[PDB]
Structure formats: C-alpha cells, structure tokens
Amino acid sequence: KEMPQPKTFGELKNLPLLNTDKPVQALMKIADELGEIFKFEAPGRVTRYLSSQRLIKEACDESRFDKNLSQALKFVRDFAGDGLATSWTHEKNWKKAHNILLPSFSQQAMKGYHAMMVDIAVQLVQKWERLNADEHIEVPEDMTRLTLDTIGLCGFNYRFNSFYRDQPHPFITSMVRALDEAMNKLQRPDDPAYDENKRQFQEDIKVMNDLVDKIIADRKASGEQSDDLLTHMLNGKDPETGEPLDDENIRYQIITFLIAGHETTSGLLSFALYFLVKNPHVLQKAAEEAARVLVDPVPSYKQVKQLKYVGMVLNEALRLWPTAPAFSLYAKEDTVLGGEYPLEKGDELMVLIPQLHRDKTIWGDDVEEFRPERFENPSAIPQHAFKPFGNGQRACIGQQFALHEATLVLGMMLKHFDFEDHTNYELDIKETLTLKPEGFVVKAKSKKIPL
Amino acid sequence: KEMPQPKTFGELKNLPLLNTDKPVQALMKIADELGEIFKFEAPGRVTRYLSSQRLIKEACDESRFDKNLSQALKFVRDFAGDGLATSWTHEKNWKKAHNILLPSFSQQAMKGYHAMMVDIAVQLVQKWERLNADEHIEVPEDMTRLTLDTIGLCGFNYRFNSFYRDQPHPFITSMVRALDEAMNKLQRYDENKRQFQEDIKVMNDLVDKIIADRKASGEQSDDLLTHMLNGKDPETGEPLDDENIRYQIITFLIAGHETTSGLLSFALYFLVKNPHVLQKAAEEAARVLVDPVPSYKQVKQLKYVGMVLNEALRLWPTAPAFSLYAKEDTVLGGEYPLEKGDELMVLIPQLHRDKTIWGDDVEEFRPERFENPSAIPQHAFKPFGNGQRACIGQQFALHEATLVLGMMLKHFDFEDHTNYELDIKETLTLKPEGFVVKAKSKKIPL
Ligand code: HEM
Ligand code: HEM
Numbered sequence: 001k002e003m004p005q006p007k008t009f010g011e012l013k014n015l016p017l018l019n020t021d022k023p024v025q026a027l028m029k030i031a032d033e034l035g036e037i038f039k040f041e042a043p044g045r046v047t048r049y050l051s052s053q054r055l056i057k058e059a060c061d062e063s064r065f066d067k068n069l070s071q072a073l074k075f076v077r078d079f080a081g082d083g084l085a086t087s088w089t090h091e092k093n094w095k096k097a098h099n100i101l102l103p104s105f106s107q108q109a110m111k112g113y114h115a116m117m118v119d120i121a122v123q124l125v126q127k128w129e130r131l132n133a134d135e136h137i138e139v140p141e142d143m144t145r146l147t148l149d150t151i152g153l154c155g156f157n158y159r160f161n162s163f164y165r166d167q168p169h170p171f172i173t174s175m176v177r178a179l180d181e182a183m184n185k186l187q188r189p190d191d192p193a194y195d196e197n198k199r200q201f202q203e204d205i206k207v208m209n210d211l212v213d214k215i216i217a218d219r220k221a222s223g224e225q226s227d228d229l230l231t232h233m234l235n236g237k238d239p240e241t242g243e244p245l246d247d248e249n250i251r252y253q254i255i256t257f258l259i260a261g262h263e264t265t266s267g268l269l270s271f272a273l274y275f276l277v278k279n280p281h282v283l284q285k286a287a288e289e290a291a292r293v294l295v296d297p298v299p300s301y302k303q304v305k306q307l308k309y310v311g312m313v314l315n316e317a318l319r320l321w322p323t324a325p326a327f328s329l330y331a332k333e334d335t336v337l338g339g340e341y342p343l344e345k346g347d348e349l350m351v352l353i354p355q356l357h358r359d360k361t362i363w364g365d366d367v368e369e370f371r372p373e374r375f376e377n378p379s380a381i382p383q384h385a386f387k388p389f390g391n392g393q394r395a396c397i398g399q400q401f402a403l404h405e406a407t408l409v410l411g412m413m414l415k416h417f418d419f420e421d422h423t424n425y426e427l428d429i430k431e432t433l434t435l436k437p438e439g440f441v442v443k444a445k446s447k448k449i450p451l
Numbered sequence: 452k453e454m455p456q457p458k459t460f461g462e463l464k465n466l467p468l469l470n471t472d473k474p475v476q477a478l479m480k481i482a483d484e485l486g487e488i489f490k491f492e493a494p495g496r497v498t499r500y501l502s503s504q505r506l507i508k509e510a511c512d513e514s515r516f517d518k519n520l521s522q523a524l525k526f527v528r529d530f531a532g533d534g535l536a537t538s539w540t541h542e543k544n545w546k547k548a549h550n551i552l553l554p555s556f557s558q559q560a561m562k563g564y565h566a567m568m569v570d571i572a573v574q575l576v577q578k579w580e581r582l583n584a585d586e587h588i589e590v591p592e593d594m595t596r597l598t599l600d601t602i603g604l605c606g607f608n609y610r611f612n613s614f615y616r617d618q619p620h621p622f623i624t625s626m627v628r629a630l631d632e633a634m635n636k637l638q639r640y641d642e643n644k645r646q647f648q649e650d651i652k653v654m655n656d657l658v659d660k661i662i663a664d665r666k667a668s669g670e671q672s673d674d675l676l677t678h679m680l681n682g683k684d685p686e687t688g689e690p691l692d693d694e695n696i697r698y699q700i701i702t703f704l705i706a707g708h709e710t711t712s713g714l715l716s717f718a719l720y721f722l723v724k725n726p727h728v729l730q731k732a733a734e735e736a737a738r739v740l741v742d743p744v745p746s747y748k749q750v751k752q753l754k755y756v757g758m759v760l761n762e763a764l765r766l767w768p769t770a771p772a773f774s775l776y777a778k779e780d781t782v783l784g785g786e787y788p789l790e791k792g793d794e795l796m797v798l799i800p801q802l803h804r805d806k807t808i809w810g811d812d813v814e815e816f817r818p819e820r821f822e823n824p825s826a827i828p829q830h831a832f833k834p835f836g837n838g839q840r841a842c843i844g845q846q847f848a849l850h851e852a853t854l855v856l857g858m859m860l861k862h863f864d865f866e867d868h869t870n871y872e873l874d875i876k877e878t879l880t881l882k883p884e885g886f887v888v889k890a891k892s893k894k895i896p897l
Contacts, residue, residue, distance in 0.1 A: 281825040289829065306514065309829055362559065365751065373824050379549075379839060382557060 001340050003048065004034035005041070013041035019187045022431050024325045024354065031355045037341065040350075045071070047328070047348040048341075051355035053362045055338045057384040059349050060391040064335050066090075067394040068348050070328040072433055075182035076259065079205045082249060083256030084397060092241075093249055098393070100236040100245060101253070104229055105397045110404040112227045114301040116153040120146050121409045122298070122451055123163045125416050128444050136422065139273055139440040143266035148172060148258070150405055155257045156215055156230035171211045174204035175258060183433055212251045220247075230254065257398065260324075263434040265402045267323035268314060272410055274437050275317055275370040277421040282372060283414075286313050290414035297451050299408055307411045312372035314406050318388035319363075320370060322353040323434045327390050353387055417444035452786050454499065455485035456492070464492035470638045473877045475771045475800065482801045488787060491796075496522070498774070498794040499787075502801035504808050506784045508830040510795050511837040515781050518840040519774035519794055523879055526633035527705065530626075530651045533695060534702030535843055543687075544695050549839070551682040551691060552699070555675055556843045561850045563673045565747040567604040571597050572855045573744070573897055574614045576862050579890045587868065590719055590886040594712035594855075599623060599704070601851055606703045607661050607676035622657045625650035626704060634879055658697045675703065703844070706770075709880040711848045713769035714760060718856055720883050721763055721816040723867040728818060729860070732759050736860035743897050745854055753857045758818035760852050764834035765809075766816065768799040769880045773836050799833055863890035 009016040017040075020026050027049060030038060036052030050056050059065050066089050069077065077086035084101065087094040103109065124146045128137060145162035152160045160169045167173070181201045188194070216230065225231050233250045237243065245253070276283040286309050293306045329349040336342050343349075358367040362385040363374070375381070389396035396402070413419075420443040430438035460467045468491075471477050478500060481489060487503030501507050510516050517540050520528065528537035535552065538545040554560060575597045579588060596613035603609045611620045619627075629650040632643055662676065671677050679696045683689065691699070722729040735755045742749070775795040782788050783795075804813045808831045809820065821827075835842035842848070859865075866889040876884035 279825060281823060285825065285829055306512070308512075364558070371825060377839065377841065379553060380557065382554065382559060 003037060003039045003341060005039040006030045006034065008041075012043065015042035015045075022429065023187075024352075024431055024435065025429060027352055028355055031352055037338075047350050049350045049352050049355075051352050051359070053356060053359045053382065053385045055341075056351055056356055056387070058337055059329050059351060060384045060387070062392045064332060065329040065349065066332055068328040068330040070326070070350070071186055072182065073328070075185050076179070076433070078182070078201075079178050079208060080256045080259055081252030083252035085256050085260045089394060093245075096238045096241055096243060097245060097249060097253060098397070099238045099240055100233065101229070101397060104232040104236075105399075105401060107400045107404075110400055111301045113154045113401065114304075114404070114408075116227065117150050117405055117408055118298055120150045120153060121412050123149070124409065125412055125451060127163055128413075128417060129446055131444070134443070136441045136443050139442060140266060140270040140436045140438070143269040144262060146409060147266040147269070147405065148262045151257050151261050154228055154401070156212075156219070156254055157226040157228045158215055170207060174207035175255075177201075178204040178208065179259065179263075179433060208255055209251060212254050213247070216247055216250055216254075229257065260396075261398050261402060263432065263436070264323040265405055267321070267434050267436040268317060268402070268406050269409060270437050270440055271321045271323070271435075272314055272317040272406070273413070273419070273442065274425070274427065274440055275320070276313065276414075277419050277425075277442060279370050282313065282370065283419070286310050286372075286410075287414040287418075290411045294411055294415045299412060304404060304408045304411065307407050309372060310407050310411050310414070311403065312375040314403060314410065315375040315378070315386070315388075316370055316372040319357040319374070319386060320354070320368075321429065321435050322357065322388040323436070324388070324390075324396075325353050325435055327351050327353075327394075351387065351391075356385070356387060359385065416447055416449055418447065419444055454488060454490045454787060456490040457481045457485065459492070462494070464494065466493040473875065474638070475798075475877055475881065476875060478798055479801050482798055488784075498796050500796045500798050500801075502798050502805070504802060504805045504828060504831045506787075507797055507802055507833070508828075509783055510775050510797060511830045511833070513838045515778060516775040516795065517778055519776040521772070521774035521796070522637055523633060524774070526636050527630070527879070529633070529647075530629050530654055531702045531705055532698030534698035536702050536706045537698075540840065544691075547684045547687060547689060548691055548695060548699060549843070550684045550686055551679065552675070552843060555678040555682075556845075556847060558846050558850075561846055562747045564605045564847070565750070565850070565854075567673070568601050568851050568854055569744055571600045571604060572858050574600070575855065576858055576897060578614055579859075579863060580892055582890070585889075587887045587889050590888060591712060591716040591882045591884070594715040595708065597855060598708045598712040598715070598851065602703050602707050605674055605847070607658075607665070607700055608672040608674045609661055622654060622704075625653035626701075629654070630705065630879055654701055655697060658700050659693070661700075662693055662696055676700065706842075707844050707848060709878065709882070710769040711852060713767070713880050713882045714763055714848065714852050715855060716883050716886055717767045717769070717881075718760055718763040718852070719859070719865070719888065720871070720873065720886055721766070722759065722860075723865050723888060725816050728759065728816060729865070732756055732818075732856075733860040733864075736857045740857055740861045745857060750850060750854045750857065753853050755818060756853050756857050756860070757849065758821040760849060760856065761821045761832070761834075762816055762818040765803045765820070765832060766800070766814075767875070767881055768803065768834040769882070770834070770836075770842075771799050771881055773797050773799075773840075797833065797837075802831070802833060805831065862893055862895055864893065865890055 006014055006017060008014060017026060031049060031051040036050065036055055038049050040047050040049055050059055069086065069088065073086050080086040082091055082093040084094065084097050124142060127142065131137070149160050149162045152158045160172060162168060178201060181197055184197070219230055219234065230250070233245050233253060236245065276286060289307060289309045293303050296303070329351065331343045331345055331347045333345050334343065360367055362382055389399040422443045423441060425440055428438045429435050457465055457468060459465055468477060482500060482502040487501065487506055489500055491498050491500055501510055520537065520539065524537050531537040533542055533544045535545065535548050575593060578593065582588070600611050600613050603611045611623070613619065629647060632647045665676055665680065676696070679691050679699060682691070722732060732755050735753060739749050739752045775797065777789045777791055777793045779791050780789065806813055808828055835845040868889045869887055871886055874884045876882050
C-alpha cells in the first residue's frame, strides 16, 4: 500500500538523483533496493518506476494505460515534432502516420530495404578488412556509422558517407548535439548561463530542418521513385482519413527515424559483440551458423531470416541492456495497480526495462548471465516479460527494421572475422537517452572470405 | 549422394526389420552400420533415419521442415485425437491449444503444481521407508506409479492412488493396452480391434465424466483442467471445446507418464552404476534439501541433479524419435536432395551418441557434460523435440523428476543388489525392464 521512495534533497525532492552521468543504472540500483515499484518526486512532477513483470503487464493493458510523453520525449519533441515517437496517441497525426507507415515497416517490407542495408554492411566489412595488423576497431563508433548511414539510405536515399569521415556530416553533429541538450535539460535551475545552450539548440534544429526539408523538396521536384521511406510517405494515404502526410510531418518522421533508430540499433550491435567476445562458446555457436547460412558473397533476405541463433544472441543482448531503456504511461482513468497501488486519472508510470528483464520470478536466478539459449522458442516467453521495443500500438514501428539490420550485420561480422577482446575490456555503459558500451574495442582478424 | 539402406525382404522392403521386440535399438544398430542417414522403405512408405548432428541441425530448421505424424503417432491419434501431440501444425486445434496451454506449462506455472507433485513424491518416499529388510524396489513400476499419479493430480485433480494398488486403475489398463495395440500395428485381428474400441470408450468415458463433473461442480483447482475450461486463445479468442479438452487430458497421461518414469528409472540406473556420480548428487540433495518438504526454489537449486537427468536423457531419451516432412524441395547436408513432402525420422539416441559432438566417451555417464548449455552445439541435444512442436511438458517433467530424484537421494542409500544387467523394454517409450534396487533409509523425517 505505502510506496517506497528513494532519498530526498529538501525542496528538490528526488530530482538531484538524476544529476548523474548514468541515470538508468542509478535507477536500476534504486529498484534493486526498493523493489518492483518506487515513487519519484520532483518540483511539479510525480512518477512511479515499475520493475516487475507483475506490475508491468498491467501497465501494458491498453484499456487502462496509454503512452505518456516522458520529460525526455517532450524535450525531443522540440525537434522531432509530431513524429510517431513524440506524438500523443490521440493526436490526429499519430494514427494517420501510423496507418501510412506500418506496411512500409513490416517484415515483408524488409525485402525492399535489404539491398541498401547490404550496401552499408559491405562498407563496414571492407573497412575492417582494410585495417592494418594491431590496429583495432572502435565498436560503437563504427556501429553508429553503419546504422546512421543505413537509416539515411533506407529513410530517404541520402548518403551520409560516415565511413569516409572522421567528423560526421553536419546533420549528424547537430542531431547528436540536439539530443545531448535534451538529455542535459533533464539533469538541470534555468540560469542565464544556459543561454548559449539554447541558442545552439535552435541552430541545430535549423540545420536538421533545412537538410530534411531540402531533400523532400528535391524529391518532389524530381518526381523520382526510390525504395525508401520518403517515397512511401510522398505517395501514401491514410485509409482512415484519406489524407497523406504533409511535408512538415514527413520531415519530422525522417528526423524521428534517425533519432529513434540510429543509437538504439548501434548500441544493440555493440552490446551483442561485447557479450560475444566475453562468451566464447556463444561466439563459436553464432559463427558456425553464420558460416553455414551465409554461403554467398552477399547475404540474401531469406538467408538473414535463417540466422536463428544470431537472432537469439540479439534478443539476449536486448534483454540485458535494452538500448531504449524506458517508456512512460499514464492512467486513462482511476484504477488500482497490482491490487494495492491506487492510481488517479492522469497518474504517470515509468517502465524500467532493464529491471523488468532481470525479474527473477520470470527468468530464474541467472538473470545476469548472457545465455541466448533462453530465446530458443520466443512463444514460451511469458507475456510482457520481454519489452525492448515497448508496448501495444505504441510499440517500436522499426522493430523489424532494427532486427533485420542487426541480424544481417552481425551475421556478416561473424562470417568474415575472428574477434579478440585484446584489452580485456571492462564494461562501461555511457548513457545518453540510449545506452552503449563506451570505449569498447576489439581486434578483428580476417577469415579472408571474399565479398 | 547415394543413400544407404539396410537389408530388404523382397516385396516387403525393410518392413520385417521392425518385427522385433526392440525396434529402436535395432535401428540404432543399423545406424551404427550405415552411418548418419539411411533410407527405410516399406509397402507404401518411405522414410529416412537421421543420426548425426550435422544433418539433424538442418532437419530442425522450421522454415524447411514441419512435424510429421509418424505411423506410431497416427495410430495413437485414434485415441489421443487432435490433442497437442497427435495434431498437425496446420490444424486449428493445434495452435489454439498451444497458445492456451503454454502459460500453464511454464516454469512459473510449476510453482502452482509443486504442492501436488510433493504430495505424490512423499507417498513414494513413505512406501520405501515402510519396506521391510531385504525387500526390494521395482524401480520402473514405482516410478510409473508416481508419474501417473502426479499427472492425474496436476492434470485434473484426480487421484489414481497407484500406491494403494497392485492392479492399475481401469483407465490405465485401457490406455496401456491401447498403446500396445498402436505399437503392435507397426510390426503387423478382430479381437484386437474390438478390444481397441473398448479401450477407447473407457478412456473417453472417464475423462468426459471428470470434465462434466468439474463443470457441474464449478470448483476451481490448480490443475490443467481448470485452465482449459477457463482459457481463451488470444489469437482466435476461442476456448477449447470439451472434446478437445478430453484429448488433451488423454495426451498428458500418454505423453508424460511413461517418458517421465523412464527418465527417473534410467537416471537411478545410471546413478547406481556410477557411485561417484551418485555420491555427488546425494551430496547436493543433502546440502540443498534442508527442510522436511522441498520447496519450489530448492528444486531449482538441484543443479547437479538436473545435469544427471539431462545426461540420462542423452543416453536413453524416453521418447526416442520424432518425424518431420519437407515443406518444399530442399537439399539436406548438400548431398541428399529431398522433394516436398519427403519424410525424415530423427533417431534421438543415435544423435546423442554423435562422437563429433560429445567426444569419444559417448557411452559414459558424465553429467558434467551439461555444465554450460552454451558449449553444446545447436540441435545436438533433442530429448524434447524441436521448435514450436517441442515438448510442452518439458518443464513439468524436469521439475517432477528433479524433485523426486532429489528426495530419493536425500532419504536413501541405494544398492544395486542384483548387479542388474541393463535390459531396455520397448513400447512407444523406453525403460530398464526388471531394474531393481534395495534402499536403506537415512532415517530423515518428512
Ligand atoms: C534495437 C533498436 C531499437 C530499439 C530497442 C527501439 C526501442 C523502442 C521503444 C522502447 C519504443 C517505445 C517508446 C515509447 O513507448 O515511448 C520505440 C518506438 C519507436 N521506434 Fe524504436 N527502437 C529501435 C529501433 C528503431 C528503428 C531502427 C526505427 C526506425 C528506423 C525506430 C522507430 C521508432 C518509432 C517511429 C517509434 C514510435 C512508434 C509509435 O509510437 O508510433 N526504432 N522504439
Ligand atoms: C522426460 C519426459 C518427456 C520426454 C522425454 C518427452 C518428449 C517429447 C518429445 C520428443 C516430443 C515431440 C514429439 C514429436 O515431435 O512428435 C514431445 C511432445 C509433447 N509432449 Fe512430451 N515428453 C516428456 C514429458 C511430457 C509431459 C510430462 C507432458 C505433459 C504432462 C508432455 C506432453 C507433451 C505434448 C502435449 C507434446 C506435443 C506438443 C505439441 O506438439 O504441441 N510430455 N514430448
């Protein structure tokens, strides 16, 4: 009945607890101490963090709870607009864009993106083939190059050419700095010395809008048709309203794909490779499948679907470190959670995904061990125990995209290289709005298999 | 390219090879002679027995192969109906019951069955505590009493009371005799047919009555029948009808009781034949089972006992084969072209003796092989089948077997007083026939 709550800071309540460079990991430690639910109070803000499958399965009941915009999402909305990830379910543009975009993100639609994904994947493999002896790989840096370029190519047929650069394309620099400002605002009084941050923030917003608006205008003027999401959005019509997306909303969706997809997906690849080099038996099993299945110089769509164990590796990496680590809900009406926590209409909940994925009542006592064999049969996994892609109609629309991209790329990596954890890397998880293993490095020795 | 085939009998092709009292063991000997794959032809039937992890890992690719009803399963279907084990994947009632029953067979659902499992396990322990000096234990007989009563209690809150009886419950007599007819038909009568239909009626009558009684009573138990009466398939939104619920109950009794008791019997056999392994398992039992009654959490802590059971399943998987068909034209192992609909048999005991996987000591009983599941290659160990058609009762069987074996090792020292010579009797399952031991109580109260 009485809800646990972490330490307070006078008038600031719990807010200073988030003034730390690893806030998700701090919240996990608080959940370890306080249990399946704790209250978190700030000036003008109350929320409750959920960690157990017992309570989260109720929070995922869409008749009782709807997606809430967390403070992080509200700040991202300043440049993602009413894109899919930062719009309320009741906003006309959410259901409109959802209906238009769902078929172009289906498993069947990955057949059309496959060639462009292979284009960037081959660039990554060639970069590593061309490294000299005793040079090493900066894993998240290269994974982020790959996912950004892949979303750029599949999203709107634009080549960021990240593998030709040390300093990223100006759009990426402004996007990363915009996301950084959004995160920093969470841990922040509105002192006059933040005026520089604000002026830079508006400059970065303009950089993103200008490039994306320009590409949209260029595409409309040309009339050319590609296999990208931009073509689908220029030609799609919502069956419900009968309307297409307008040019401004299309821009917000493109920005959203880049934000929502690039860092989550590169983090997944980075964590997956981290767990593989730390668990050599798993690596060997995953590399055997890669060599057996990927028998052609270029992987096909059907071959990627056959990489079952690689997919199991990715799910277990998502279990331990889900790279979009939380989502927020509000109670649609007065309701009682778990039979002991009464909630009033509008009350907010946070789903702490890494804690959910460590619920021993679901996964057993070995929750911290990396064992892809947990995912041999996904249907056996209990409902709402595994939520790396969110929930319900507000779940990740790019789930099939992210997993196809990650399975293809990891499969090619395991096919073409042996990996060495040459520094005995100590896991250090850097936190933005997503999670990544900072400073993770490996050496790759080519198996000399041509492309 | 050219596929080996054992000796033929003119028009009967290979069929007379199955007219033997130990057909699985005969097929294992053929696999020893012919290798990882051989064709087996009969009048109107062609199948291919696979024995190597190399080929079986491909056969377990669900995009290329689906479960086939073997001739044995087709005959069992005459009384298991479209229960889970004897239904095709494309049958509406398979996916429906699969979705409904999966949560009631989860590791989490074992917490609710644990008390009833302990009920029967304590009865087994008390039977052995009450034996007189120089009396002995008929191991598979008592293990079958236990597994039969446990599924009856957990399945539909019914007490077969096998530990109060010499002659089994009338349902069991008809079930065993029906399974006997199903097996005999493979190696093969008006009396047999009339008896077969009588046994079907006995099974249907009792199960339909228990279902009707439960609906009339309205009572709610912690059993599978309650879940099936109240469950709805999330996909179709439909519940199982009463006829299918009956077939599921019959299936649980068939699919679970003899496989699981065979596992316990083989496990105890290997333990008494390997005293160092028994001692290690007994040491774990005494360290973990510190209360008069094991808890659910304690059973999960019996790690080495779990390895013992897995190694027993490796050597003698008690459901020794399953059947697959090719969904489309495909090439197996890069040299064996298969046409759509072509059938495969997975010879599990041979798979589990693949020296390229387990090393040269494949016949030795070493639970330590199972220290890390990640070290085992994909699809090398398949005692519970494969994919979405894998054993739904796997967590049930292993929880029951781990609980019971743990209590046995806590409460008794065992003697292989006859120096028992392994003799594996074959039905549709496997068991060490005539396996007997003496148990000396450690005098630990319950
Ligand atoms: C492994 C990689 C990814 C993970 C773990 C992930 C995770 C998530 C999660 C947890 C949500 C729910 C957020 C909430 O409820 O507030 C979400 C939503 C979303 N994601 Fe992802 N995501 C990934 C990749 C991608 C990719 C590649 C794309 C597109 C190119 C994408 C686009 C979106 C969109 C548009 C939404 C909002 C959908 C809606 O609410 O209508 N994501 N994602
Ligand atoms: C150690 C004991 C057991 C072993 C070795 C075993 C083995 C197997 C195997 C190999 C299959 C696949 C059959 C095929 O592909 O044709 C299977 C399926 C099945 N088993 Fe078990 N089993 C055991 C115990 C149990 C128990 C205790 C139950 C239930 C109480 C059970 C119920 C089932 C069912 C319903 C299926 C069919 C699942 C489906 O296709 O949806 N089994 N079992």
